[PDB]
């Protein structure tokens, strides 16, 4: 396993290099049926640039065929959130879904139910701009996030998840914070997850209300990863 | 499952 | 504050000594269970432990030092959180089982009936079976049982309202740190432990979610009907 | 509302 022989500095250009592109959404005022339209399509796009990313995550190609795919199952919208969040931190108060897509909480009230978890989306963006999350950090959070969230449904994924736990750290220790206050936003970052699985938790239950609602007919990859959870 | 095949190449 | 003055030995001693009793339930073993006995027994012990954690809570450190609707709101968020997490923990001792009461131990094929809850069964006995891995210290126990009271509805809130909770959040971290430095672990060793355990968080996080779904399920359900105060709590995930 | 009532009795 050359996840674990890597040097945390080497981890960190590992996943910087592995980052996803941001996509456009297509061009051209809302609907529900409209916005949940071309989100829908998004989030699609999104989904196989994700998959394609975790294959590049260090030590995610270690795991069997369906390891890899109980983990993606199971982390898929914490990923896409988190993603969501992070390139909405330098526009407070907006959501940057995609660069011809930034919206505000009062554009996402044309969408029944999605207003709830766009506060808490952007509520997870002010705390990162708060903490003034730096990319290096960002990466190795959402690596987390993909090989912690479905492990308790396994020795080397928390074989994986130390490593950036020690890349963290050092990350931390570059940027000239003492010991203490090394483990304190150590903390401080582990708990956003928290958060990050409780929106995640309240998406699943708002898109699977979107598929006995019919409004926009799902694509046949966002079902699979949807009637996942359960 | 789509999973499947988007994993495998 | 005199919460942000405590030592972490100071902090420990006073989390410890604020713990709440393991409650007994009204089970009887002469009968063979069914899915609204069983209901019943879960609903009018959980209820007790409500109260018994409500006071508890008043006696985490910081928490007195914030306004009712504050209080309120971070209990209406965690109170399953922590109820689960102290299911866990004094079920840590049984393999394959839940300590609900010291007359009350149940596997996953009782837990099998009352529909659905298997699934969650599954889920606290892998958190209970993780816990005993990392052999988890009653000393981390009652920090990490208090970051999930200040922690999970703190993102769901003018006059400076987090500054304070994230700054006893610190302290608490603080507080793990020294424990592990005397437990003889090196300082990566004291890191990682300190992830390990934050990363459960984000799963009994989980659980309680799932576990809120199966509870709105039930009584609409209309098996045992429950006490007023869980529908209190349960109303809040709205 | 009863947690209301438990948190200042
Ligand atoms: C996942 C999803 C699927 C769907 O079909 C409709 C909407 C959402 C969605 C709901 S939300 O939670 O407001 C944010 C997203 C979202 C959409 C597109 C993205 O590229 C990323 C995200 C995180
Ligand atoms: C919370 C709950 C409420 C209810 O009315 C019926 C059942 C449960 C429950 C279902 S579960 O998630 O299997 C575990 C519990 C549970 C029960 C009693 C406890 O003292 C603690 C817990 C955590």
Redesign the interface.
């Known amino acids: 396993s050359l996840a674990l022989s890597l040097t945390a500095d080497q981890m960190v250009s590992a996943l910087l290099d592995a980052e996803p592109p941001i996509l456009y959404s297509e061009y051209d005022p809302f609907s529900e049926a409209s916005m949940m339209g071309l989100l829908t399509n998004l989030a699609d796009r999104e989904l196989v640039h994700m998959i394609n990313w975790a294959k590049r995550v260090p030590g995610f190609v270690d795991l069997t065929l369906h390891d890899q795919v109980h983990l993606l199952e199971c982390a898929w919208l914490e990923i896409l959130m988190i993603g969501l969040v992070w390139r909405s931190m330098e526009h407070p108060g907006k959501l940057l879904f995609a660069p011809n897509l930034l919206l505000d909480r009062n554009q996402g009230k044309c969408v029944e139910g999605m207003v709830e978890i766009f506060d808490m989306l952007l509520a997870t963006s002010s705390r990162f701009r708060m903490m003034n999350l730096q990319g290096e950090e960002f990466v190795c959070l959402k690596s987390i996030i993909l090989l912690n969230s479905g492990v308790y449904t396994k020795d080397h994924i928390h074989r994986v998840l130390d490593k950036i736990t020690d890349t963290l750290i050092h990350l931390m220790a570059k940027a000239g914070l003492t010991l203490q206050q090394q483990h304190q936003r150590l903390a401080q970052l582990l708990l956003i997850l928290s958060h990050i699985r409780h929106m995640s938790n309240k998406g699943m239950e708002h898109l699977y209300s979107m598929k006995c609602k019919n409004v926009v007919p799902l694509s046949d990859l966002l079902l699979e990863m949807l009637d996942a959870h359960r | 499952?789509?999973?499947?095949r988007?994993?495998?190449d």
Not at chain 2, 1 to 4: N, Q, V, Y
């Open positions: 499952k789509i999973l499947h988007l994993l495998q």
